[PDB]
Design a protein around this ligand. Structure first.
Ligand SMILES: CCC1=C(C)/C(=C/C2=NC(=C\c3[nH]c(/C=C4\NC(=O)[C@H](C)[C@H]4CC)c(C)c3CCC(=O)O)/C(CCC(=O)O)=C2C)NC1=O
Ligand SMILES: CCC1=C(C)/C(=C/C2=NC(=C\c3[nH]c(/C=C4\NC(=O)[C@H](C)[C@H]4CC)c(C)c3CCC(=O)O)/C(CCC(=O)O)=C2C)NC1=O
Ligand SMILES: CCC1=C(C)/C(=C/C2=NC(=C\c3[nH]c(/C=C4\NC(=O)[C@H](C)[C@H]4CC)c(C)c3CCC(=O)O)/C(CCC(=O)O)=C2C)NC1=O
Ligand SMILES: CCC1=C(C)/C(=C/C2=NC(=C\c3[nH]c(/C=C4\NC(=O)[C@H](C)[C@H]4CC)c(C)c3CCC(=O)O)/C(CCC(=O)O)=C2C)NC1=O
Ligand SMILES: CCC1=C(C)/C(=C/C2=NC(=C\c3[nH]c(/C=C4\NC(=O)[C@H](C)[C@H]4CC)c(C)c3CCC(=O)O)/C(CCC(=O)O)=C2C)NC1=O
Ligand SMILES: CCC1=C(C)/C(=C/C2=NC(=C\c3[nH]c(/C=C4\NC(=O)[C@H](C)[C@H]4CC)c(C)c3CCC(=O)O)/C(CCC(=O)O)=C2C)NC1=O
Ligand SMILES: CCC1=C(C)/C(=C/C2=NC(=C\c3[nH]c(/C=C4\NC(=O)[C@H](C)[C@H]4CC)c(C)c3CCC(=O)O)/C(CCC(=O)O)=C2C)NC1=O
Ligand SMILES: CCC1=C(C)/C(=C/C2=NC(=C\c3[nH]c(/C=C4\NC(=O)[C@H](C)[C@H]4CC)c(C)c3CCC(=O)O)/C(CCC(=O)O)=C2C)NC1=O
Lengths: 49, 160, 161, 173, 160, 161, 161, 160, 160, 161, 161
């Protein structure tokens, strides 16, 4: 995430499962600019990116 | 409780609590003395409220206890009364919370999946809670019986 | 997301027992302060903008986070602050009514200090803003009500630290 | 760290090829200004304890708030002499690592030994980033006062100090 | 010296000197006599130079010479030229062994606590060495004084 | 996302000072090359498909990534390449105009090498494609313009490594 | 998401060769068991609720995860189980028809053990439920069909471990 | 600037820059000599452009400086002119960037949240910038006053 | 290079660079013209320096190319010469960097783990580099052959 | 760090009951395979260097991670691999003897995939190296012993994924 | 730890003298041999393993210290020798460059003969191992350079005796 790593949920069928928390201890803040584009991957072919 | 969902209501709406919400949190906490007395009556009457609860349940539904019924034998009949002790306990929570929110997420959400998956007739357990309701409201005055009975019939509604 | 009644019911339910004298003893203690919390949450709703205006002017208004280079320089960044301070004064109001700080870490504290480090928001100036905001909140609601509302401010400051 | 040379050689190793002439032209540009990069460095050692002193007075003459009480924001500016002693010490470092980095002809030594965690450290102590960057370029103008009649020493001196300025910024645009 | 720094710096890694280091010894030894020729120039001008150092360290700082200052009196000023003589003698060592250790193992390491226990103002001694470097430029031509210039200002950097 | 003027204004603003002689000295240096960058970005827009066709045929056209089992075998996978190489030649054109490689890591470099490792895309063949693409780009725009456009190609290759 | 035919075609395609005698040799082996898998998936669809009711009553019905404090106490939590066990018996049916366990880790296994640790779901009791569910599934579909359906149950149990 | 958003425009569209985009980056950099002269006029006229800017602002809005106004007293009036020095500075950035992109993300985005949260009348600060505009365009020719005034009125538009 | 480790040496010691360090960065950059000529000789002699390098390597170590040797056949012998092209390339880096720092962290650190894990006789590859050294020093004068050979024998030392 | 006996004792102890027939039933199953695991761990200790030399030459020896730019180019980086592959073949030997993969995630898996992403190590090539290393390990120890040693390799590959 | 040019900055200095004609006369004598010592230290670095392999094969193998019971029997004990002989050939190289044997007794000689008596290492065979190592070192570096490197070998042999 542009905020820390404990912000993107698990991409499962049905969720609200955020593993990073007070119980897991696996956190990683990184500095991201006010504008920036994450590199998403198309669930499908490649030219429809 | 009324305090937690009056908050999460006004929480979602991006606003604070109105007088309609804060004159009822106020009205509920002054009601709190009378609620603990009502729950205190059902707390140490579980011996009679449950055992007489299963009294009328078997007289009205002898199939569930007869050979072939789900609660047949010394074993299942003990668990047959165990669930009534559960639901009688949750009604004591709902009376003190001033809402069926404790009864909602315990013993009501997905209850049909459990009892259908246990082979238990869900209509039969609904008959059990109704028998407990007549015993419970018989232990309290009219002003209280409109509450203690009031939480049972909600459990009756969601259990069918 | 549990209030004092929800937390009392949970602990009494998690052992499978009824609400004995000790569980109702705390519940009676919560109902006694039910009148105090609403009036505390009443005035805080009225003076929400005034409290935040008093805190920032008293803690971090003229410090060099306010000047160029500081963490609060641009108008978007300044406007994010009073938006950000509004949640602390708002969610603390919810904890003051519910009588349980479970809503704070559920909806505020988790991923918060990990987020400010990402943006580079100074946690030191943030807590002093909340401390100053706690100081003005004790002005409005009184002493004991300020003790109640103040009890959740430092809970935010502790976990945010 | 990596100088201009080793940074150039890693450029051609990643591609796994020998050094062509475009690669060698980059090395020759260092070897030409390499003799000029030293008396810039040699002037700094002779002017080191001075150049921090002119930077401080030029800084606090515009930021008198840095020598004053912090306000209730517990902020680390040069309030007390304990604060002032350590705060002059940081100007030591910015002149030092920007002195090696003039000789390396590359800012590799800067970011890994100065920039990495710099916003981390200053956000902990609540240190000014604004005035901290302004003193970095008060040094730059002060150093460029000596080499001023020509203008090819100026780009050399500007490169380390300009790199700390752009990198310590929270990006407004 | 410089070879000693290479033998030491190669010894803590448990290896022979590499290709670059053997340059650093070979280039240092090829510039050998020019340090030897230079130090004989400076040794013949030690009475030259320290007389010029006492010119400007005291016209700049009459606080020390005046009655009350540390250097007031004959015998206090007598060793005053001796400290210049030892420093200038140390620099001839540093100019020869082409590095800073004879200026650092002696003279620099712990110099402030020496002077502070003596009463000599440590800022004044910095100007004394800066005065000494100002004095060496006159009795030395432009070719070789920038050879000896970096050995002086290391002392000023060491004293702060 | 800053150009040379944005980066100059930011550093001059982040210290709270005006644009002195050193800040404008670099800005004048950028305006001098403003004429060169547009013509460089002009011809690259014209020969976008021709440059990518030249790079792949010169670097990785017949290698065994192109054959079965190689990383580029299927037509979807081959078509993803020239789609993928188009961004490198396109975003490098943006860096050549803006005079600052901030747009590359903002929109290309971040999560890129971490993405190719997920897909299993060979970073070694990728950089040589960009190196070959850098070689043909110096053909079109000339020497110094190729030096400018080439200065952002290896920036991609460095960070992508 | 590949079946036995998709996996055979992929490996034969990934080398760029035709379907030789060895590739068709496995395909003929899959078509021979095509009649067995449908009848296996037939009865499992019929007795889906009965199989899950048999597994939970045989493995974890009366253990103290079922009692208060255990991991399965509340009715929402109990109802999540039979919802959760339905996927294992359902997706295992898909693997039994497709003849390839690729669908399991694609849609079940990934992020599964990492999710139960988040919720605090006991992986030990989960596998024994699936093992007991595997035991009843061999009752219905027979021995060899149970060997087929059982071959994907422990695949879930292995990766979920 | 025009260079950075002509890029990010063509960046999003998966394409390079058209002649319409590259004949204007070209046209802008040849305009760069004339832009620095215009910004150079406003740079060392901030003493008059700001002080006369707050001149007409108080004559047109005496409420904001009268007792009860937001900028009342020696203190707030100094900050009352400080913001005008800010916005006059951002206009010098917009003139050199050839766009209000510097003025956009500084002093314009979310400006109503700040001034509403400071108790300042946002319409009053808009009146201040208009008073600065008449002073600024009075310092330049007609060809320049169509630019320097042009960036002020954009700030006027976004500030209400 | 000599520039980067003369820095990181003085970096660790909390000090600046001495005259001993700055009169060698100075002495190295004036040496830079002569270094590029030396590396330019080895750059486009890799066809002869490698192919004649593997010439003497097989005449001195026929086991490695004989049937059973690690570099047996058309395949391994091509890779047998590929590594010599690698190490000949790193020597060109060390000559321009003025140190074996490029050769250190490429092709030397942990080299025995690779070649032991590849089944290659590490002594055999050391013999290959020595054969390249006689070809390389035969291409240059005596003043240069004391350098180009100087980096090979360091690689010989670390490769056993 | 539990073996099969430690895990059996823990589950039987965590309910406070003695070792009943079901707990000893699995323990007898572990003692039956005790003879197989030692001989499996015997030959793996002997051919440790030979197995790793076979896996890298069969999976990732000549791919372009091995060439310049690839993730394994420099000799320090190549030497880190066989050092790194030694742990997978070694810790998998420990899991094969202990009969429980608890030691793997305790000492290998935790912070592993989070570490390779930091270094930029390709997880895709890593798993195929372990898969190829699993393939040669089934050569030495036999079929069923390879099934045992192979059961912990893919456990590493699953969690490392 | 003093070199030649640093032993004359103790003698011209510990009594407090300057560098007269006699002190510089020896310094000029050291700078004349500066070219010889580096080439001597050059080839010794190259043939370090070859020199030690030649010395042990020429002197101390041959005599029942190598056989069982001798002082060098076990592989740990044999491996300690070439480790031990490496220091003598290495530190002697340092003395040859520094032109002063102060580093030897500072870092080698002190506590050395007192240590070998503790371990029971034969000092007689050790001196022969260094004398033979001195003999091969004169082969490589030449006659006069061998005279220089040989001048520090017997210094070790003298003090170690
Ligand atoms: C703008 C910055 C940016 C980049 C660079 C980017 C890359 C990117 N490259 C991709 C795939 C790909 N990329 C390649 C590329 C290659 N194969 C080779 O052998 C060569 C070395 C290389 C061509 C140079 C291939 C073959 C795929 C398809 C992979 C697959 O189907 O598994 C994908 C997956 C989705 C898709 O293509 O639709 C993304 C997201 N995304 C971004 O936002
Ligand atoms: C707090 C909310 C809540 C409820 C209600 C609950 C029910 C519940 N009822 C159960 C069993 C049972 N429940 C019954 C119930 C009945 N038989 C009849 O004839 C009657 C109609 C009916 C009772 C009035 C029987 C016979 C079993 C045992 C079934 C078996 O052994 O297969 C079990 C499995 C054994 C156990 O762990 O107790 C659970 C979990 N759990 C909860 O957390
Ligand atoms: C090599 C790169 C590098 C830097 C720059 C660095 C800085 C650094 N600055 C510090 C403190 C400090 N720095 C300052 C500095 C300032 N106060 C102001 O008001 C001014 C803006 C500024 C002077 C320009 C002050 C006051 C403290 C002490 C804070 C306190 O204790 O109150 C500290 C904590 C004390 C310590 O050194 O252990 C560190 C580590 N460390 C590094 O490794
Ligand atoms: C090799 C390095 C080295 C030094 C430098 C050194 C210095 C030294 N300076 C001393 C005293 C002194 N030094 C001074 C010096 C000065 N007054 C001035 O105005 C000047 C700036 C300065 C001389 C240039 C004075 C006034 C005293 C006498 C203080 C007293 O005893 O009252 C003393 C006490 C005994 C003595 O004079 O010998 C020592 C040991 N020792 C060393 O080993
Ligand atoms: C298709 C692949 C797939 C699976 C398997 C899956 C599982 C999954 N199981 C969940 C919860 C749950 N799972 C259980 C299960 C159990 N409790 C026990 O004691 C037993 C050991 C076990 C039953 C076998 C319980 C009780 C919850 C509720 C946890 C809670 O409310 O905190 C949740 C949280 C959300 C929800 O249920 O709505 C998910 C997402 N999601 C998927 O996409
Ligand atoms: C670069 C874009 C930008 C702007 C515009 C900006 C404004 C800004 N205006 C402020 C205060 C203020 N601004 C005013 C302004 C006014 N009073 C009036 O009557 C007039 C209508 C108006 C000015 C023309 C006053 C009175 C205060 C002090 C308010 C107080 O003390 O409560 C403050 C708080 C103190 C400070 O840190 O300066 C900020 C941050 N910051 C920015 O970064
Ligand atoms: C830049 C530093 C560096 C080196 C040195 C290096 C070596 C290296 N040598 C290799 C193979 C090899 N190397 C040899 C070498 C030899 N056979 C002999 O008989 C001779 C003694 C010797 C050569 C003189 C052989 C035969 C192979 C193939 C081994 C096999 O196929 O199993 C491989 C695996 C294939 C490849 O990716 O090229 C690497 C990575 N990589 C590096 O990054
Ligand atoms: C016991 C559990 C455990 C593991 C597994 C572990 C891994 C680990 N692997 C590392 C590096 C590495 N690992 C590799 C591995 C590979 N390159 C490839 O292309 C392949 C896919 C792969 C070999 C299979 C490489 C090349 C490095 C060096 C990275 C670098 O220098 O940047 C490092 C960095 C430090 C070092 O190696 O000294 C650690 C800590 N640590 C542990 O405690």
């Amino acid at each position: 995430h542009p905020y820390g790593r404990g912000n993107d949920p698990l991409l499962i069928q049905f969720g609200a499962i955020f593993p990073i928390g007070t119980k897991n201890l696996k956190q990683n803040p990184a500095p991201f600019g006010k504008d920036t584009r994450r590199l998403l991957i198309r669930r499908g072919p490649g030219i429809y990116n | 409780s009324i305090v937690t969902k009056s908050i999460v209501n006004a929480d979602a709406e991006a606003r604070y609590l109105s007088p309609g919400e804060l004159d009822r949190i106020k009205s509920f906490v002054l009601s709190g003395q009378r609620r603990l007395r009502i729950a205190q009556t059902l707390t140490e009457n579980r011996e009679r409220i449950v055992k007489q609860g299963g009294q009328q349940l078997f007289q009205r539904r002898p199939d569930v206890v007869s050979p072939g019924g789900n609660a047949y034998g010394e074993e299942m009949t003990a668990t047959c009364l165990r669930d009534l002790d559960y639901y009688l306990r949750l009604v004591t929570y709902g009376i003190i919370a001033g809402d069926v929110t404790p009864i909602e997420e315990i013993g009501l959400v997905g209850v049909k999946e459990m009892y259908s998956a246990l082979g238990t007739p869900i209509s039969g357990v609904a008959e059990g809670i109704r028998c407990m309701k007549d015993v419970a409201c018989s232990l309290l005055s009219g002003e209280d019986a409109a509450e203690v009975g009031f939480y049972f019939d909600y459990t009756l509604a969601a259990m069918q | 997301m549990q209030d004092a009644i929800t937390s009392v019911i949970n602990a009494a339910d998690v052992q499978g027992k009824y609400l004995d004298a000790n569980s109702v003893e705390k519940l009676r203690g919560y109902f006694q302060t039910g009148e105090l919390r609403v009036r505390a949450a009443a005035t805080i709703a009225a003076n929400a903008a005034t409290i935040i205006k008093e805190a920032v002017a008293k803690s971090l208004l003229y410090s060099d986070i306010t000047r160029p280079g500081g963490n609060m320089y641009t108008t978007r960044r300044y406007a994010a602050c009073i938006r950000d301070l509004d949640y602390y004064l708002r969610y603390a109001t919810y904890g003051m009514l519910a009588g349980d700080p479970s809503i704070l870490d559920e909806r505020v504290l988790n991923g918060l200090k990990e987020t400010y480090n990402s943006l580079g928001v100074p946690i030191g100036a943030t807590i002093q803003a909340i401390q100053a905001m706690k100081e003005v909140t004790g002005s409005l609601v009184g002493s004991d009500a300020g003790k109640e509302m103040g009890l959740y401010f430092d809970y935010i400051c502790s976990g945010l630290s | 760290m990596q100088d201009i040379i080793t940074s150039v050689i890693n450029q051609y190793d990643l591609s796994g090829r020998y050094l062509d002439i475009k690669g060698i032209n980059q090395i020759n540009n260092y070897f030409d200004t390499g003799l000029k990069r030293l008396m810039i460095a040699k002037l700094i050692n002779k002017e080191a304890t001075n150049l921090i002193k002119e930077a401080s007075e030029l800084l606090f003459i515009e930021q008198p708030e840095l020598l004053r009480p912090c306000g209730n924001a517990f902020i680390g500016n040069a309030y007390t002499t304990r604060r002032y002693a350590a705060c002059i010490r940081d100007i030591e470092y910015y002149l030092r690592y920007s002195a090696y980095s003039i000789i390396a002809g590359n800012n590799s030594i800067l970011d890994e030994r100065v920039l990495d965690g710099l916003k981390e450290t200053y956000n902990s102590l609540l240190v000014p980033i604004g005035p901290t960057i302004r003193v970095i370029q008060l040094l730059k103008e002060i150093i460029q006062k000596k080499f001023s009649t020509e203008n090819i020493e100026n780009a050399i001196i500007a490169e380390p100090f300009d790199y700390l300025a752009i990198n310590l910024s929270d990006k407004n645009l | 010296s410089l070879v000693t720094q290479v033998i030491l710096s190669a010894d803590d890694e448990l290896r022979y000197p590499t290709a670059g280091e053997l340059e650093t010894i070979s280039s240092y030894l090829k510039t050998g006599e020019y340090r030897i020729r230079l130090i004989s120039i400076l040794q013949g001008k030690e009475q030259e130079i320290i007389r010029l150092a006492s010119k400007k360290i005291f016209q700049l700082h009459p606080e020390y010479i005046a009655p009350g200052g540390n250097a007031s009196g004959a015998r206090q000023r007598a060793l005053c030229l001796r400290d210049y003589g030892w420093y200038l003698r140390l620099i001839t060592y540093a100019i020869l062994a082409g590095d800073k250790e004879p200026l650092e193992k002696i003279g620099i390491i712990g110099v402030r606590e020496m002077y502070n226990s003596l009463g000599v103002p440590i800022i004044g001694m910095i100007d004394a060495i800066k005065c000494l470097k100002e004095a060496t430029v006159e009795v030395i031509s432009q070719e070789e004084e920038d050879f000896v210039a970096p050995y002086y200002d290391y002392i000023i950097q060491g004293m702060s």
